[PDB]
Design an enzyme around this catalytic site. Structure first.
Site, PDB file in Angstrom:
ATOM      1  N   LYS A   1       1.228  -3.196   6.885  1.00 58.55           N
ATOM      2  CA  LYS A   1       1.801  -3.444   5.532  1.00 58.55           C
ATOM      3  C   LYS A   1       3.333  -3.308   5.531  1.00 58.55           C
ATOM      4  O   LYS A   1       4.031  -4.098   4.922  1.00 58.55           O
ATOM      5  CB  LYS A   1       1.127  -2.546   4.490  1.00 58.55           C
ATOM      6  CG  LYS A   1      -0.323  -2.844   4.228  1.00 58.55           C
ATOM      7  CD  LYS A   1      -0.483  -4.244   3.696  1.00 58.55           C
ATOM      8  CE  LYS A   1      -1.845  -4.431   3.108  1.00 58.55           C
ATOM      9  NZ  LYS A   1      -2.033  -5.814   2.658  1.00 58.55           N
TER      10      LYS A   1
ATOM     11  N   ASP B   1      -5.416   9.312   8.142  1.00 56.90           N
ATOM     12  CA  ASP B   1      -5.318   9.798   6.728  1.00 56.90           C
ATOM     13  C   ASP B   1      -4.196  10.823   6.610  1.00 56.90           C
ATOM     14  O   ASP B   1      -4.039  11.690   7.465  1.00 56.90           O
ATOM     15  CB  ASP B   1      -6.596  10.484   6.257  1.00 56.90           C
ATOM     16  CG  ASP B   1      -7.732   9.538   5.971  1.00 56.90           C
ATOM     17  OD1 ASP B   1      -7.470   8.300   5.959  1.00 56.90           O
ATOM     18  OD2 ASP B   1      -8.899  10.046   5.820  1.00 56.90           O
TER      19      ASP B   1
ATOM     20  N   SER C   1       0.851  -1.211   0.000  1.00 59.02           N
ATOM     21  CA  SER C   1       0.000   0.000   0.000  1.00 59.02           C
ATOM     22  C   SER C   1       0.878   1.249   0.000  1.00 59.02           C
ATOM     23  O   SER C   1       1.933   1.277   0.651  1.00 59.02           O
ATOM     24  CB  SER C   1      -0.941   0.027   1.184  1.00 59.02           C
ATOM     25  OG  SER C   1      -1.529   1.297   1.387  1.00 59.02           O
TER      26      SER C   1
ATOM     27  N   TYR D   1      -3.029  -0.093  10.040  1.00 57.39           N
ATOM     28  CA  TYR D   1      -3.116  -0.741   8.729  1.00 57.39           C
ATOM     29  C   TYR D   1      -1.818  -0.558   7.933  1.00 57.39           C
ATOM     30  O   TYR D   1      -1.168  -1.536   7.491  1.00 57.39           O
ATOM     31  CB  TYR D   1      -4.325  -0.207   7.960  1.00 57.39           C
ATOM     32  CG  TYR D   1      -4.282  -0.566   6.506  1.00 57.39           C
ATOM     33  CD1 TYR D   1      -4.392  -1.881   6.074  1.00 57.39           C
ATOM     34  CD2 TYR D   1      -4.109   0.432   5.544  1.00 57.39           C
ATOM     35  CE1 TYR D   1      -4.326  -2.202   4.720  1.00 57.39           C
ATOM     36  CE2 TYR D   1      -4.102   0.114   4.179  1.00 57.39           C
ATOM     37  CZ  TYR D   1      -4.220  -1.197   3.769  1.00 57.39           C
ATOM     38  OH  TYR D   1      -4.191  -1.483   2.401  1.00 57.39           O
TER      39      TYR D   1
HETATM   40  N1  LIG Z   1      -7.484   0.743  -1.972  1.00 54.48           N
HETATM   41  C1  LIG Z   1      -7.464  -0.496  -1.860  1.00 54.48           C
HETATM   42  O1  LIG Z   1      -8.485  -1.249  -1.965  1.00 54.48           O
HETATM   43  C2  LIG Z   1      -6.062  -1.042  -1.542  1.00 54.48           C
HETATM   44  C3  LIG Z   1      -4.884  -0.255  -1.625  1.00 54.48           C
HETATM   45  C4  LIG Z   1      -3.619  -0.821  -1.283  1.00 54.48           C
HETATM   46  C5  LIG Z   1      -3.618  -2.137  -0.841  1.00 54.48           C
HETATM   47  N2  LIG Z   1      -4.768  -2.881  -0.735  1.00 54.48           N
HETATM   48  C6  LIG Z   1      -4.653  -4.258  -0.235  1.00 54.48           C
HETATM   49  O2  LIG Z   1      -5.084  -5.183  -1.243  1.00 54.48           O
HETATM   50  C7  LIG Z   1      -5.700  -6.305  -0.639  1.00 54.48           C
HETATM   51  C8  LIG Z   1      -7.055  -6.498  -1.230  1.00 54.48           C
HETATM   52  O3  LIG Z   1      -7.791  -5.252  -1.080  1.00 54.48           O
HETATM   53  P1  LIG Z   1      -9.326  -5.222  -1.565  1.00 54.48           P
HETATM   54  O4  LIG Z   1      -9.693  -3.788  -1.802  1.00 54.48           O
HETATM   55  O5  LIG Z   1      -9.558  -6.264  -2.584  1.00 54.48           O
HETATM   56  O6  LIG Z   1     -10.132  -5.548  -0.217  1.00 54.48           O
HETATM   57  P2  LIG Z   1     -11.199  -6.699   0.058  1.00 54.48           P
HETATM   58  O7  LIG Z   1     -11.625  -6.533   1.462  1.00 54.48           O
HETATM   59  O8  LIG Z   1     -12.251  -6.664  -0.968  1.00 54.48           O
HETATM   60  O9  LIG Z   1     -10.382  -8.021  -0.233  1.00 54.48           O
HETATM   61  C9  LIG Z   1      -9.727  -8.695   0.835  1.00 54.48           C
HETATM   62  C10 LIG Z   1     -10.306 -10.096   1.028  1.00 54.48           C
HETATM   63  O10 LIG Z   1      -9.587 -10.833   2.083  1.00 54.48           O
HETATM   64  C11 LIG Z   1     -10.553 -11.569   2.793  1.00 54.48           C
HETATM   65  N3  LIG Z   1      -9.876 -11.807   4.055  1.00 54.48           N
HETATM   66  C12 LIG Z   1      -9.391 -10.886   4.915  1.00 54.48           C
HETATM   67  N4  LIG Z   1      -8.753 -11.473   5.947  1.00 54.48           N
HETATM   68  C13 LIG Z   1      -8.814 -12.796   5.690  1.00 54.48           C
HETATM   69  C14 LIG Z   1      -8.321 -14.027   6.329  1.00 54.48           C
HETATM   70  N5  LIG Z   1      -7.641 -13.932   7.446  1.00 54.48           N
HETATM   71  N6  LIG Z   1      -8.508 -15.222   5.768  1.00 54.48           N
HETATM   72  C15 LIG Z   1      -9.180 -15.350   4.610  1.00 54.48           C
HETATM   73  N7  LIG Z   1      -9.738 -14.278   4.004  1.00 54.48           N
HETATM   74  C16 LIG Z   1      -9.512 -13.003   4.438  1.00 54.48           C
HETATM   75  C17 LIG Z   1     -11.797 -10.679   2.807  1.00 54.48           C
HETATM   76  O11 LIG Z   1     -12.926 -11.431   3.102  1.00 54.48           O
HETATM   77  C18 LIG Z   1     -11.797 -10.092   1.418  1.00 54.48           C
HETATM   78  O12 LIG Z   1     -12.538 -10.890   0.476  1.00 54.48           O
HETATM   79  C19 LIG Z   1      -5.715  -6.040   0.902  1.00 54.48           C
HETATM   80  O13 LIG Z   1      -4.565  -6.680   1.466  1.00 54.48           O
HETATM   81  C20 LIG Z   1      -5.548  -4.576   0.941  1.00 54.48           C
HETATM   82  O14 LIG Z   1      -4.938  -4.166   2.182  1.00 54.48           O
HETATM   83  C21 LIG Z   1      -5.986  -2.337  -1.065  1.00 54.48           C
HETATM   84  O1  LIG Z   2     -16.137   7.828   2.839  1.00 53.20           O
HETATM   85  C1  LIG Z   2     -15.027   8.325   2.614  1.00 53.20           C
HETATM   86  C2  LIG Z   2     -13.887   7.511   2.399  1.00 53.20           C
HETATM   87  C3  LIG Z   2     -12.706   8.141   2.098  1.00 53.20           C
HETATM   88  N1  LIG Z   2     -12.615   9.476   2.039  1.00 53.20           N
HETATM   89  C4  LIG Z   2     -11.359  10.124   1.676  1.00 53.20           C
HETATM   90  O2  LIG Z   2     -11.099   9.671   0.312  1.00 53.20           O
HETATM   91  C5  LIG Z   2      -9.710   9.329   0.138  1.00 53.20           C
HETATM   92  C6  LIG Z   2      -9.472   7.870  -0.184  1.00 53.20           C
HETATM   93  O3  LIG Z   2      -9.838   7.118   0.986  1.00 53.20           O
HETATM   94  P1  LIG Z   2     -10.055   5.554   0.989  1.00 53.20           P
HETATM   95  O4  LIG Z   2     -10.549   5.166   2.371  1.00 53.20           O
HETATM   96  O5  LIG Z   2     -10.877   5.126  -0.211  1.00 53.20           O
HETATM   97  O6  LIG Z   2      -8.609   5.047   0.681  1.00 53.20           O
HETATM   98  P2  LIG Z   2      -7.163   5.271   1.364  1.00 53.20           P
HETATM   99  O7  LIG Z   2      -6.499   6.405   0.630  1.00 53.20           O
HETATM  100  O8  LIG Z   2      -7.325   5.521   2.850  1.00 53.20           O
HETATM  101  O9  LIG Z   2      -6.363   3.913   1.138  1.00 53.20           O
HETATM  102  C7  LIG Z   2      -9.033   9.827   1.396  1.00 53.20           C
HETATM  103  O10 LIG Z   2      -8.483  11.144   1.258  1.00 53.20           O
HETATM  104  C8  LIG Z   2     -10.122   9.818   2.477  1.00 53.20           C
HETATM  105  O11 LIG Z   2      -9.963  10.818   3.511  1.00 53.20           O
HETATM  106  C9  LIG Z   2     -13.739  10.257   2.299  1.00 53.20           C
HETATM  107  O12 LIG Z   2     -13.618  11.532   2.285  1.00 53.20           O
HETATM  108  N2  LIG Z   2     -14.871   9.666   2.539  1.00 53.20           N
END
Ligand SMILES: NC(=O)c1ccc[n+]([C@@H]2O[C@H](COP(=O)([O-])OP(=O)(O)OC[C@H]3O[C@@H](n4cnc5c(N)ncnc54)[C@H](O)[C@@H]3O)[C@@H](O)[C@H]2O)c1
Ligand SMILES: O=c1ccn([C@@H]2O[C@H](COP(=O)(O)OP(=O)(O)O)[C@@H](O)[C@H]2O)c(=O)[nH]1
Ligand SMILES: NC(=O)c1ccc[n+]([C@@H]2O[C@H](COP(=O)([O-])OP(=O)(O)OC[C@H]3O[C@@H](n4cnc5c(N)ncnc54)[C@H](O)[C@@H]3O)[C@@H](O)[C@H]2O)c1
Ligand SMILES: O=c1ccn([C@@H]2O[C@H](COP(=O)(O)OP(=O)(O)O)[C@@H](O)[C@H]2O)c(=O)[nH]1
Ligand SMILES: [Mg+2]
Ligand SMILES: [Mg+2]
Lengths: 335, 335
Positions: free
Chosen positions: A153, A294, A124, A149
């Site tokens: 990571k 944030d 992330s 969080y």
């Molecule tokens: N903006 C984003 O969505 C974003 C940005 C950077 C990193 N990530 C990372 O990418 C990954 C996927 O994100 P996402 O948006 O698809 O979220 P998501 O919540 O849709 O996907 C994560 C999945 O993991 C499952 N899960 C969580 N803990 C578990 C466990 N212990 N055992 C089995 N299943 C488990 C959840 O049920 C879910 O289906 C996460 O690690 C997240 O931190 C997401």
């Molecule tokens: O309901 C929401 C969720 C997020 N944010 C803002 O939108 C951006 C993206 O947030 P999100 O939680 O989607 O992702 P993050 O950047 O924390 O991984 C950030 O600046 C948050 O402060 C917001 O204003 N309202």
């Protein structure tokens, strides 16, 4: 080539599952459905015409993960499973550290036991804390994380680096995702968390279709042009393709780091405006206090992934908003 | 006042157990005897004339830890349980991260569930990596850890800090121990790990009494006066008293950090010489390559603990060596 996708029913995973299956990889999912529906994997199969071998349960369940590795010949693992909300993490640190650190540790123990030594880790932009420079490169120092969080990571990245110190036959790929948004072009699959969406765009999509009342904008006093947070939004399909590009191009040992973003930063208010353009009506929003954890602004220089993996994310903010609204309109209560 | 001591049969714990029991605290031990003997707790009871309530098992065993908190009314926890060898950690990162991070996480989950919110964590001078300044204070920046053991301690400190963010009614005391050495004056209790001792002084003690052949000195090319590593050795009894001083003096919420050392740094060769003085004969040693993860020199400014806790470690390197040899002579195969 068989890929195990942990968290395989979630938002980014299901998009990735599609892109892997369309390229001829075999896919196995493990998910506990904490933030996803099993129906999402039915939609992956429908779109692709290909199977996803489904395991239901927790990546921290050593017996379950043993079964997965004993019953299948796995080449690569993509570890998406985790809890992912910056604000929630501040309130629930032990839930975050337990789920995120211990899923990774149980996974690695089982992978080592079976000599499966190629992992893509879902990292992330939060690992950079308050960014030392903008745009962020893979040379930008990490640390100063502001919330459990993001901390989790960065901790996991270090764990994985230390696996490679101890056994340099590993391939560790740390993909620092920025902010994935949008939905598969079919509209048959999109973002569908459980409960109230924690991420901005699934919330905005639901307000646009009348399923939620008002977008909550967390803070307008950041040091940004309009005071709201700025992020590098990346289309989830482009992000999914990025995973396929790793597996297509990296077949050697080492630790490989990539920022996956567009280099285009948008404020919260700008995101709402893109959705309003896609919807053809105003989308109600209110200014709320800052959400703990944030930071003001983060966006990527993704040169390195373009050079090394041949990959670039070129879908636009309008592609993101339109595809999101297409999904949400056709599936207003999700799956 | 009841204190749960995890890793309660180990080297520092058993010394601490004595000092707590002599001050009128009740003590409960949980230990898996990975690096200790149950006989050590018999020796604590013998020295003090007081009971230690003994639980046998793993701090990662949630059911066991539930039993401990359900069956006893615990006021304070001292969390010593961990794997602790810098060099081994580089070779066995997942063993270290699993044991050290997940013991802490299971403990915290159970403590929260029972509203027990006062912890002393056994941290380490290794959290400072290559020290930004000498002597080290609690203002010296942390990070740049060189090995998974030290990394794991810094990670755990952050986990604990985040517990207090989420619930500021906690009392978190992070004690950064330097290098504890020696034995209780009775000679009935001392350092007795399993296998070949990983720490310098128990190894040196065993060579001095003819139970091991040769002290292995890991590196003589550090930037130190004689090229061998320099450390702040602290008598284990003084270190034990430091824990009692925390519990005697801190009865408020907050995160409290202390370096526990003497401020006297000795090289490896100087340690051997102190033991040779205590033994009255040469103690054979050989120069060996550097051990992975070791840094050149670390020693403490422990002003803050003296001001805030009334505590100072004044037993000398000769007290340490003599007490160690007294134990080892009277117990050449340990327990
Ligand atoms: N903006 C984003 O969505 C974003 C940005 C950077 C990193 N990530 C990372 O990418 C990954 C996927 O994100 P996402 O948006 O698809 O979220 P998501 O919540 O849709 O996907 C994560 C999945 O993991 C499952 N899960 C969580 N803990 C578990 C466990 N212990 N055992 C089995 N299943 C488990 C959840 O049920 C879910 O289906 C996460 O690690 C997240 O931190 C997401
Ligand atoms: O309901 C929401 C969720 C997020 N944010 C803002 O939108 C951006 C993206 O947030 P999100 O939680 O989607 O992702 P993050 O950047 O924390 O991984 C950030 O600046 C948050 O402060 C917001 O204003 N309202
Ligand atoms: N130089 C030092 O000895 C030093 C310096 C700084 C910090 N520390 C820390 O102080 C603590 C105690 O050090 P020590 O020298 O007494 O070592 P030790 O090995 O004698 O004591 C640790 C005890 O924990 C037990 N244990 C480990 N993992 C366990 C688990 N999961 N469940 C139950 N029992 C477990 C071991 O069996 C052992 O009795 C450790 O956390 C160590 O990292 C030690
Ligand atoms: O058998 C040994 C064990 C340790 N050391 C050195 O002695 C010092 C203290 O090491 P120990 O493992 O006791 O503690 P650490 O400082 O790593 O916590 C360090 O400079 C080590 O390089 C050594 O030369 N031989
Ligand atoms: Mg097997
Ligand atoms: Mg209970």
């Amino acid at each position: 080539t068989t890929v195990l996708v942990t968290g395989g029913a979630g938002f980014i995973a299901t998009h990735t599952d599609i892109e892997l299956l369309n390229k001829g990889y075999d896919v196995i999912s493990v998910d506990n459905y904490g933030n996803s529906s099993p129906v999402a994997l039915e939609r992956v199969e429908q779109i692709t015409g290909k199977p996803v071998k489904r395991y239901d349960g927790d990546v921290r369940d050593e017996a379950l993960m043993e079964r997965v590795f004993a019953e299948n010949n796995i080449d690569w693992v993509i570890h998406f499973a985790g809890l992912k909300a910056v604000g929630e993490s501040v309130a629930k640190p032990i839930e975050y550290y337990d789920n995120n650190l211990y899923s990774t540790l149980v996974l690695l123990k089982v992978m080592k036991k079976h000599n499966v030594k190629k992992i893509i880790f879902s990292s992330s932009a939060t690992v950079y804390g308050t960014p030392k420079e903008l745009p962020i490169t893979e040379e930008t120092p990490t640390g100063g994380t502001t919330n459990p969080y993001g901390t989790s990571k960065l901790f996991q990245e270090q764990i994985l680096r230390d696996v490679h110190v101890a056994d340099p036959s590993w391939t560790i790929v740390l993909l620092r995702y920025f902010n994935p948004v949008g939905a598969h072009e079919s509209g048959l699959l999109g973002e569908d968390p459980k409960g109230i969406p924690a991420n901005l765009t699934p919330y905005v999509a639901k307000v646009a279709v009348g399923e939620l009342k008002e977008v909550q904008v967390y803070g307008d006093d950041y040091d940004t042009p309009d005071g709201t947070g700025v992020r590098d939004y990346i289309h989830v399909v482009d992000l999914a393709k990025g995973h396929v590009a790793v597996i297509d191009h990296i077949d050697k040992e080492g630790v490989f780091v990539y920022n996956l973003g567009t280099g285009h930063g948008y404020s919260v208010l700008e995101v709402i405006k893109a959705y309003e353009k896609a919807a053809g009506h105003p989308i109600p929003y209110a200014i709320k206090p800052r959400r703990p954890g944030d930071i003001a602004a983060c966006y990527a220089d993704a040169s390195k992934a373009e050079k090394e993996l041949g990959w670039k994310a070129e879908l636009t903010i309008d592609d993101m908003a339109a595809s999101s609204l297409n999904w949400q309109t056709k599936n207003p209560n999700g799956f």
